[PDB]
Structures are given as structure tokens and as C-alpha cells.
Scaffold this active site. Structure first.
Site, short mmCIF file in Angstrom:
data_model
loop_
_atom_site.label_atom_id
_atom_site.label_comp_id
_atom_site.label_asym_id
_atom_site.label_seq_id
_atom_site.Cartn_x
_atom_site.Cartn_y
_atom_site.Cartn_z
N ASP A 129 -6.41 8.38 -0.14
CA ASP A 129 -5.94 7.57 0.64
C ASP A 129 -4.60 8.09 1.47
O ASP A 129 -3.47 8.66 0.76
CB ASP A 129 -5.50 6.33 0.03
N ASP A 134 -15.33 -4.47 9.96
CA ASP A 134 -16.74 -3.83 9.48
C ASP A 134 -17.48 -4.82 8.41
O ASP A 134 -18.66 -4.46 7.83
CB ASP A 134 -16.31 -2.41 8.75
N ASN A 152 -7.80 9.37 -5.21
CA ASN A 152 -8.70 8.38 -5.87
C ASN A 152 -9.44 9.16 -7.03
O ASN A 152 -9.49 10.30 -7.12
CB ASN A 152 -9.59 7.95 -4.94
N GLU A 182 0.70 -1.28 0.00
CA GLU A 182 -0.11 0.08 -0.14
C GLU A 182 0.80 1.20 0.06
O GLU A 182 0.56 2.26 -0.63
CB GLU A 182 -1.06 0.09 1.39
N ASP A 195 -12.77 9.61 -7.42
CA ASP A 195 -13.76 10.13 -7.09
C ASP A 195 -13.44 11.34 -6.20
O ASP A 195 -14.51 12.03 -5.72
CB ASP A 195 -14.69 9.04 -6.21
N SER A 241 -11.66 11.46 -3.46
CA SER A 241 -11.11 10.96 -2.15
C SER A 241 -9.54 10.74 -2.17
O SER A 241 -9.18 10.67 -3.33
CB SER A 241 -11.64 9.82 -1.59
N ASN A 275 -8.82 5.58 3.42
CA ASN A 275 -9.50 6.47 2.48
C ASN A 275 -10.51 7.34 3.13
O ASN A 275 -11.38 7.18 4.06
CB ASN A 275 -10.37 5.42 1.52
C1 LIG Z 1 -8.29 0.99 3.85
C2 LIG Z 1 -9.65 1.57 3.07
O1 LIG Z 1 -9.82 2.72 3.22
N1 LIG Z 1 -10.45 0.86 2.40
C3 LIG Z 1 -11.53 1.28 1.37
C4 LIG Z 1 -12.67 0.50 1.75
O2 LIG Z 1 -13.08 0.66 3.10
C5 LIG Z 1 -13.77 1.01 0.62
O3 LIG Z 1 -14.88 -0.18 0.83
C6 LIG Z 1 -16.37 0.20 1.26
O4 LIG Z 1 -16.14 0.29 2.77
C7 LIG Z 1 -17.26 0.66 3.51
C8 LIG Z 1 -17.15 0.65 4.72
O5 LIG Z 1 -16.41 -0.33 5.32
C9 LIG Z 1 -18.15 -0.55 3.08
O6 LIG Z 1 -19.56 -0.46 3.86
C10 LIG Z 1 -19.81 -1.58 4.63
O7 LIG Z 1 -20.10 -2.78 3.90
C11 LIG Z 1 -20.32 -4.08 4.53
C12 LIG Z 1 -20.58 -5.24 3.77
O8 LIG Z 1 -21.69 -4.87 2.83
C13 LIG Z 1 -21.52 -3.78 5.36
O9 LIG Z 1 -21.56 -4.95 6.68
C14 LIG Z 1 -21.43 -2.44 6.19
O10 LIG Z 1 -22.61 -2.20 6.88
C15 LIG Z 1 -20.98 -1.57 5.48
N2 LIG Z 1 -20.44 -0.04 6.49
C16 LIG Z 1 -21.09 1.33 6.11
C17 LIG Z 1 -20.91 2.34 7.01
O11 LIG Z 1 -21.78 1.47 4.96
C18 LIG Z 1 -18.41 -0.80 1.63
O12 LIG Z 1 -19.15 -1.96 1.25
C19 LIG Z 1 -17.16 -0.89 0.99
N3 LIG Z 1 -17.21 -0.61 -0.64
C20 LIG Z 1 -16.69 -1.77 -1.60
C21 LIG Z 1 -16.79 -1.62 -3.09
O13 LIG Z 1 -16.06 -2.64 -1.01
C22 LIG Z 1 -13.51 1.23 -0.56
C23 LIG Z 1 -14.67 1.67 -1.29
O14 LIG Z 1 -15.02 2.92 -1.14
O15 LIG Z 1 -12.40 2.23 -0.83
C24 LIG Z 1 -11.22 1.48 0.00
O16 LIG Z 1 -10.19 2.50 -0.16
#
Ligand SMILES: CC(=O)N[C@@H]1[C@@H](O)[C@H](O[C@@H]2O[C@H](CO)[C@@H](O[C@@H]3O[C@H](CO)[C@@H](O)[C@H](O)[C@H]3NC(C)=O)[C@H](O)[C@H]2NC(C)=O)[C@@H](CO)O[C@H]1O
Ligand SMILES: [Cl-]
Ligand SMILES: [Cl-]
Ligand SMILES: [Cl-]
Ligand code: NA
EC number: 3.2.1.17
Length: 129
Positions: free
Chosen positions: A52, A101, A46, A35, A48, A50, A59
């Protein structure tokens, strides 16, 4: 700060990451290498809008506030700049929330593509821990 491999492994272990949520220490060291190349000051933008931040490239869309990601969340309740410190406490504490999460370490793209399913124990070979 640019960490050494074993230096970072020892710091992560002291902060409670070894086997956190079932992920052995080698997983966290491997993720940090790909990373950020072990550099606490790493930033990347990114598509969008945002950004990292830090050794684990956390992120701003979800986890920290940098004042320029509109409509984003701050689920770790910290300024993103705190994630760039030579002290990794803030990055580790936030990573514990991320990995709990729902998706485990698949939240780290480089872990999924470059560490998952490899012999991650090799990343801590030779280290005094
Ligand atoms: C290290 C880092 O920052 N990684 C980023 C990822 O976190 C991010 O993935 C998205 O993260 C969110 C929060 O964890 C995910 O939402 C969660 O999804 C799970 C499974 O469905 C659910 O149980 C939770 O309730 C939900 N939490 C919230 C607050 O909504 C989300 O699904 C992830 N999206 C994807 C496509 O994986 C990604 C994408 O923004 O960026 C990384 O850099
Ligand atoms: Cl390991
Ligand atoms: Cl530290
Ligand atoms: Cl998991
Ligand atoms: Na944010």
C-alpha cells in the site's frame, strides 16, 4: 511530505474531493489521518505480497504497478512510486476511480473502522477553506 490537517483539507478541496460521490471533505481527511498519518511517503506490505502506497494507502494488487506484485492489476495506470509525491494529484485522481468502483469508501479499511459513522466534520474544524 507530512501535511498539516487544514493544509491537506485545502489541497483535497482544490482537487475536487469535497462531496465527490457524496463523501464530504471530513471523510477524506479522516481516512488520510488513519491510513498514513498525513505522510505522503508511507508504505506498508500486505500478507499477499502486495504493498500500500502514499497518503491514502492505495494497494498495488489492484491500482498501481510496483514491479513486484505478480498477477496484479494497474487500474490507475501509474507506477506506485508516483503515489508517494509531495504533490497529491496522482493519489487524488486514483482515489476518485477507487471510490466509484462500487463499494464507495469502504475500500479504505481504516475509514470503515475509524471514520464511518463518526462526526467527520470535526476533521475540518477551524480551517480556512
Ligand atoms: C485503497 C485501496 O487500495 N483499497 C483496496 C481495495 O480496493 C481492495 O478491495 C477490492 O477492490 C476491488 C476493486 O475495487 C473490488 O472489485 C470490485 O468489486 C465491486 C463489488 O463487487 C465490483 O462492482 C467491481 O466490478 C469490482 N472491480 C474489479 C476490477 O474487479 C473488490 O471487490 C474488492 N475486494 C474486497 C474484499 O473488498 C482490497 C482487497 O484487495 O484491498 C484494499 O487495500
Ligand atoms: Cl465534512
Ligand atoms: Cl498537492
Ligand atoms: Cl457510496
Ligand atoms: Na499492480
Amino acid at each position: 511530505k507530512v501535511f498539516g490537517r487544514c493544509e491537506l483539507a485545502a489541497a483535497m478541496k482544490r482537487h475536487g474531493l469535497d462531496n465527490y460521490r457524496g463523501y464530504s471533505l471530513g471523510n477524506w481527511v479522516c481516512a488520510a489521518k488513519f491510513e498514513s498519518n498525513f505522510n505522503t511517503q508511507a508504505t506498508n506490505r500486505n500478507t499477499d505480497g502486495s504493498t500500500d502506497y502514499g497518503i491514502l494507502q492505495i494497494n498495488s494488487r489492484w491500482w498501481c504497478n510496483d514491479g513486484r506484485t505478480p498477477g496484479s492489476r494497474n487500474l490507475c495506470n501509474i507506477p506506485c512510486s508516483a503515489l508517494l509525491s509531495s504533490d497529491i494529484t496522482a493519489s487524488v485522481n486514483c482515489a476518485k476511480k477507487i471510490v466509484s468502483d462500487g463499494n464507495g469508501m469502504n475500500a479504505w479499511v481504516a475509514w470503515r473502522n475509524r471514520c464511518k459513522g463518526t462526526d467527520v466534520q470535526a476533521w475540518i474544524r477551524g480551517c480556512r477553506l
